[PDB]
Amino acid sequence: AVPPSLRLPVIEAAFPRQLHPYWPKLQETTRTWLLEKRLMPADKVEEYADGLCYTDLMAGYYLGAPDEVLQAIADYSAWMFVWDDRHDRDIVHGRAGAWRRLRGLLHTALDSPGDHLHHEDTLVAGFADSVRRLYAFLPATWNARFARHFHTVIEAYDREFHNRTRGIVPGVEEYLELRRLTFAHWIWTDLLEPSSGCELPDAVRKHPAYRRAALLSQEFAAWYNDLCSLPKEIAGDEVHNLGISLITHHSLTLEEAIGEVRRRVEECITEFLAVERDALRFADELADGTVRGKELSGAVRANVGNMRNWFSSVYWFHHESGRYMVDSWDDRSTPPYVNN
């Protein structure tokens, strides 16, 4: 089963898994999309793609999403992983010029993806493809919000570059602000809306209960990744991890830091369960008997429901994905699925 140091019985008992019915087609289609966009080598796609469970992760998250919405999300999510991989490889191989150029290309492509569908850099071209498809579901105000959020995410990745180049391990709270961006908290929160087929008015999505529930879902996911990816990231000289920040700055041992991380991870679960009642109560309040009210009520309920799904999907993803199976690699510093 799941290692005791990563065991979360509450998740296993109170957060039952869910799987989108489109998943089987999703797994094959994203794999095809990875190949035809040349984002991974053909033989690495063959050997590793399905084992990475990227599609599985998303299909256990955005339940109720239209098939084409889930597809665009999965393709984007898969791109996000290979972006993390080249971000890592640029740092290790010390390719600062290449990173800065990619950084500039991503910013530009984010606002104008159509112009970049056939850019020479395949990573850019793949990004433009998934982003443009994501822009075809909801009004431009949502597209603008997604872009504004991802612009921040890119710069967050640039901060990580400069931290790792200089060996700077961020302070605990410095990291926590940073982790909200490098994990793309608000992208995932944004994508809840096209999954339920409705852009929420600011007044609804900025409701304190919605805000708190959305945050707690992402804080759990990010910090659990830190807990589970810690072995691979130490071996890979990654410095961005709550466990690492606690060791470096609070003189915690490895054993102590792991215990501290899971406690914070567990606080997320119980805090979420509290505010989930508030968020769900808010959903009931939106249903005032009007058509518009019924729409907003249903959207919020689905979204909060998927905030909950994020817990279970992320939890099992870290135990099923080959991305974190560092023990099974010849070279622990270089993941076999990574373009080296």
Ligand SMILES: CC[N+](CC)(CC)Cc1ccccc1
């Ligand atoms: C690894 C990068 N990722 C996924 C693409 C987005 C920043 C975080 C993540 C890791 C593991 C599970 C869910 C999200």
Ligand SMILES: [Mg+2]
């Ligand atoms: Mg990483």
Ligand SMILES: [Mg+2]
């Ligand atoms: Mg990273």
Ligand SMILES: [Mg+2]
């Ligand atoms: Mg990680």
